[PDB]
Structure formats: structure tokens, C-alpha cells
Write an enzyme that holds these catalytic residues in place. Structure first.
Site, PDB file in Angstrom:
ATOM      1  CG  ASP A   1     -36.988 -35.633  16.761  1.00 38.38           C
ATOM      2  OD1 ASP A   1     -36.862 -35.054  17.844  1.00 38.38           O
ATOM      3  OD2 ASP A   1     -37.983 -36.259  16.460  1.00 38.38           O
TER       4      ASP A   1
ATOM      5  CD  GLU B   1     -39.828 -35.465  19.306  1.00 36.50           C
ATOM      6  OE1 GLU B   1     -40.150 -35.774  20.460  1.00 36.50           O
ATOM      7  OE2 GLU B   1     -39.766 -36.293  18.387  1.00 36.50           O
ATOM      8  CD  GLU B   2     -41.167 -31.208  22.880  1.00 39.86           C
ATOM      9  OE1 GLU B   2     -39.935 -30.881  22.876  1.00 39.86           O
ATOM     10  OE2 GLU B   2     -41.607 -32.194  23.527  1.00 39.86           O
TER      11      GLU B   2
END
Ligand SMILES: Cn1c(=O)c2c(ncn2C[C@@H](O)CN2CCOCC2)n(C)c1=O
Length: 500
Positions: free
Chosen positions: A274, A292-293
Site C-alpha cells: 500500500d 492507497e484510496e
């Protein structure tokens, strides 16, 4: 022709095949376990431990919205009773949901914008998708939220700075918690912890927020229709001693590098990186929508880490084992779209966790490009990545490959060729192989491959390669006149080794 170079991906270690036999799941001083281990069985919903709700309201544990200490001015009333009253109403229009959330968030009645929620419900969804949302999905979400005291019976400790601690909890428990975060019920959360309440998901226009919302509702519909049966573990890892990189005599490990594929699909069973904010999950509950999101959206159980995970310091990471993928998507950032529901195919380990291991490691943000070649900055990224890859005491033969890419490149100003090499050194020092995804950049694939085999064939050590990085700094960067240096890194390295 060639879509990948190096060691075949087929030859890289993956879970569950590479995995060690797990010890028996049990709570300890450094391991919180929120389910009945004696009753854990494949295919069954885990039973909470303990049987009755127990409450802690202090600065070491999550403050639960069902706590009797969660009060509001009337004389103090029970905010939990207020939340029940507010949410146990028919919604038939988006304003009704806004008004419900604001009843127990009165102070935020002017601050919180619900435009994106309103636009999602009214201007994006079909009339039939809108009806199912308010006739089925939202009422099912309210019920799982309000079952919190029956589901999450055990206080959840905060994973605070410098703690080495694990929490293992049920997907079901996570679902109840996330339904609470959707309805913005978590008290005292509106500065060293990420946002957990979803209020910023509802604000603004962005064409992003409709896709986020569709992704999350895909999750909410599945988990409230049929409880997931598995567990998830969240571990904060925080190391005290880092390698003396100049002195490290370990050899490099294997590399597979490809410009096609994704970490999450093609790196199944591998340690998946991540590319994190130091506040884990970044702008998932707000405006961000890059690597990441996206992961936190398609595997929403990751989001709960924001409830209890303090901002990462430089020697720390978060390791999450067991999260389930509920959605598929296309595009990236401004082109991100929700495509469809995903049926997660991953096997589960002996703790009923999906064999999916994700590590959050936050890169540094370089305002000035050359800053990242400063030794302190190189060591910082090496040690962060090392902490993220190291599994103390585990043999190397039981370590999956690292599945990564251009960590901290993009908004953060990282150099892809430098960061690739930094991850290659970290991985070698942790005794793991590397699977590297360049996402369409075929030249970077050739480049990383060519450097990797060059250093491997000449048997340079981790320390040899790091000394070369220092040489690059000292000769081309430290006294450099301009934004960019005279010679690029990889060419510098080739010349330096071929010269010597
Ligand atoms: C980290 N990451 C990405 O960067 C990504 C992604 N899908 C598209 N991109 C962006 C890159 O494809 C952008 N590059 C294109 C080619 O070279 C320059 C930038 N995916 C699925 C992803 O995980």
C-alpha cells in the site's frame, strides 16, 4: 512483445503455499482477539468474545458510540439512544439521511456539506437504484450499525505510536464498525489519528465521490445481505534497530518486473504494498483516489484501520492480513470507475483469514527532487520499506515475494528508478523476492530489469549498492547547481561499476 522480464512470476513464493503452520489463535498482552477462538470454524460466522458488551472510555482504546459515556446536552442524555432514535426512521430522500446524521452531530450542522451524497442519490443513481438504496441497503446498514454492542463486545485498543501490537477481529465486526463510520457515529473524532467518520465523503462536487460511494455501497450491500465469516488481523510493527546498510553483505534477491498487471490481482498471495499516507488510508474518506484510496475502497475492511491506527512514525508500518476484495474497478484517479461486484476467490488460512497480506508504508514527500538522494533520506526510505518487509524469526523460504511498484512517485515527487532500487535493497535485506509493476511504463521495466541483472551478475551486495548510492550523492547531487543532476543514477552506477 515481452510484457515482463526477470524471474518468472510462477517461481515467486505465495501464500498459502509458502506459509508456516500458524500457532493456535489466542489473546496475549500483544494480541487482542475479539472472537471465541474455541468456536472458530470454517464457513461459520464467528461468535464475539466476550458474550456481553464491555466498555472502556479512555485514551488507550476506541471510544465506542454505544458507550454510556457518550453523552449530549439536553442535563446529559445518552447519545447512543439519540443515534438509535435518529437512524430508525424511513429515508425516502437524501435530505432525510442528512437530517438523521446531523441530529447527533448538531455542532457540525453548518460545517458538514452533504452535496456529494445528495448528487449521488438524486443525480447519479437511477430512480430504481435510488429506491433499493433507501428501501433495503440503508435500513440494513442502520441495523448492523445499531447491533454494535452485541457484535463488538470487547474494547478495541488503539495501535498507538511505538506499540508492537495486533488486533484480530471478525469481518462481521468490521462491517458493524464501518456502518457506524458511514453514519458518522464515532464520538470525539470530528489529531494524531486519521478521520474515521465518513462525513467528508458526502461533501463537495467531485466526479470521484459517486464512484467512491458506489464502491462502498457494493460492500455494504454484500456484508449486510450475508455476513462474511472470516477474520482480519491488524498489526503495528515498529523496529528499534535498522541495518547498517553500508556494511550489509547480503546478496540481492530475485526480481520479476512487468508493465502489465496489478498488485492486487497479479500479486495474489504476495506481500502487497500500500503506497500509504503516514495517516493510513490517506484521502479514502475524503478527496484522494490513487493507489492507497483505491485499495481501501475495493477492500473496505482496510478502512477500519483508521479507527485505531495512529499516524506512522519513520520506523513503523501497519500489516493487515485477511481483507477481502468486494469490488472491481477501471481507471485511476480522475478516471476511476466502479465496474462490478467481486467474488473473492482467495483461500483462507488456519485463522480463517483470506490469504491476502497488505502492508502500509508511507514514502516521504519530496518538494525538491534532489532532496531524496540525501543519504539521510535514502536510509529513511530503506528503513521504512525494510520495516514493512521484515517478519522477524520467519525463515526466508516461508516469505512471500513483495508485490510493489513506484512507491512515493507521483504526488510525492519520488524518483521511480531510485525507489525501485531502494525497495530491491530493502527486500534483499528482508530476504524476500520482488515483483514490480510499472503500470504501462515499458521503458522503466527494461531499466529496472537491466540494472537488477547487472548488479546480480556482478554479485554486488546490498552494501556495495548502497555505497554506490552514496557515491552518486557525493559526486552528482550534493554540490549540484541545478534542479536536476548532470548524470542520471542508473547510468552513473553502470559507469562506476564498469570502471572499477
Ligand atoms: C499504482 N497504480 C498506478 O500508478 C496506475 C494504475 N493504473 C494506472 N496507473 C497510472 C500509470 O499507468 C501512469 N503511467 C503511465 C505510463 O508512464 C507514465 C505514467 N494502477 C492500477 C495502480 O495500482
Amino acid at each position: 512483445d515481452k510484457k515482463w522480464l526477470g524471474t518468472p512470476i510462477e517461481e515467486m513464493r505465495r501464500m498459502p503455499r509458502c506459509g508456516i503452520r500458524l500457532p493456535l489463535l489466542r489473546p496475549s498482552a500483544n494480541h487482542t482477539v475479539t472472537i471465541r477462538v474455541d468456536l472458530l470454524r470454517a464457513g461459520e460466522v464467528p461468535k464475539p468474545f466476550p458474550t456481553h458488551y464491555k466498555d472502556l472510555w479512555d485514551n488507550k482504546h476506541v471510544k465506542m458510540p454505544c458507550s454510556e459515556q457518550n453523552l449530549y446536552p439536553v442535563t446529559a442524555g445518552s447519545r447512543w439512544e439519540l443515534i438509535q432514535t435518529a437512524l430508525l426512521n424511513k429515508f425516502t430522500r437524501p435530505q432525510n439521511l442528512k437530517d438523521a446524521i446531523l441530529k447527533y452531530n448538531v455542532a457540525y450542522s453548518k460545517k458538514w456539506d452533504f452535496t456529494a451524497l445528495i448528487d449521488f442519490w438524486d443525480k447519479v443513481l437511477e430512480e430504481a437504484e435510488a429506491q433499493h438504496l433507501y428501501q433495503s441497503i440503508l435500513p440494513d446498514m442502520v441495523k448492523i450499525a445499531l447491533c454494535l454492542p452485541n457484535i463488538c463486545t470487547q474494547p478495541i485498543p488503539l495501535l498507538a505510536a511505538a506499540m508492537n501490537h495486533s488486533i484480530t477481529m471478525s469481518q462481521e465486526q468490521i462491517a458493524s464498525l464501518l456502518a457506524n463510520a458511514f453514519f458518522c457515529t464515532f464520538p470525539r473524532r470530528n489529531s494524531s489519528y486519521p478521520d474515521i467518520n465518513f462525513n467528508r465523503l458526502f461533501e463537495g462536487r467531485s466526479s470521484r465521490k459517486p464512484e467512491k460511494l458506489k464502491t462502498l455501497f457494493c460492500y455494504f450491500r454484500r456484508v449486510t445481505a450475508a455476513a462474511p465469516t472470516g477474520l482480519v488481523t491488524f498489526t503495528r510493527q515498529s523496529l528499534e534497530d535498522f541495518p547498517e546498510w553500508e556494511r550489509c553483505e547480503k546478496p540481492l534477491t530475485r526480481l520479476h518486473v512487468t508493465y502489465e498487471g496489478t498488485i492486487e490481482e497479479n500479486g495474489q498471495g504476495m506481500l502487497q504494498v500500500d503506497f500509504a499516507n503516514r495517516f493510513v488510508g490517506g484521502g479514502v474518506t475524503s478527496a484522494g483516489l490513487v493507489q492507497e484510496e483505491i485499495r481501501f475502497l475495493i477492500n473496505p475492511e482496510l478502512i477500519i484501520s483508521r479507527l485505531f491506527t495512529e499516524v506512522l512514525d519513520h520506523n513503523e508500518c501497519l500489516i493487515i492480513t485477511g481483507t477481502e476484495q468486494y469490488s472491481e474497478y477501471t481507471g485511476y484517479a480522475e478516471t476511476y470507475r466502479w465496474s462490478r461486484s467481486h467474488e473473492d476467490g482467495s483461500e483462507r488460512d488456519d485463522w480463517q483469514r483470506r490469504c491476502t497480506e497488505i502492508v502500509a508504508i508511507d514514502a516521504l514527500h519530496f518538494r525538491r527532487y534532489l532532496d531524496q538522494f540525501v543519504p539521510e533520506k535514502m536510509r529513511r526510505e530503506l528503513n521504512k520499506a525494510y520495516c514493512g518487509f521484515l517478519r522477524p524469526g520467519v525463515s526466508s523460504e516461508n516469505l512471500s515475494a513483495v508485490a510493489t511498484g513506484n512507491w512515493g512517485c507521483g504526488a510525492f515527487g519520488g524518483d521511480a528508478r531510485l525507489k525501485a532500487l531502494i525497495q530491491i535493497l530493502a527486500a534483499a535485506a528482508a530476504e524476500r523476492d520482488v515483483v514490480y509493476f510499472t503500470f504501462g511504463d515499458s521503458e522503466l521495466m527494461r531499466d529496472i530489469y537491466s540494472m537488477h541483472i547487472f548488479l546480480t551478475e556482478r554479485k554486488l551486495t546490498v552494501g556495495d549498492v548502497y555505497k554506490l548510492l552514496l557515491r552518486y550523492y557525493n559526486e552528482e547531487c550534493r554540490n549540484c547547481s541545478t534542479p536536476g543532476p548532470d548524470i542520471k543514477l542508473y547510468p552513473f552506477i553502470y559507469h562506476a561499476v564498469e570502471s572499477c
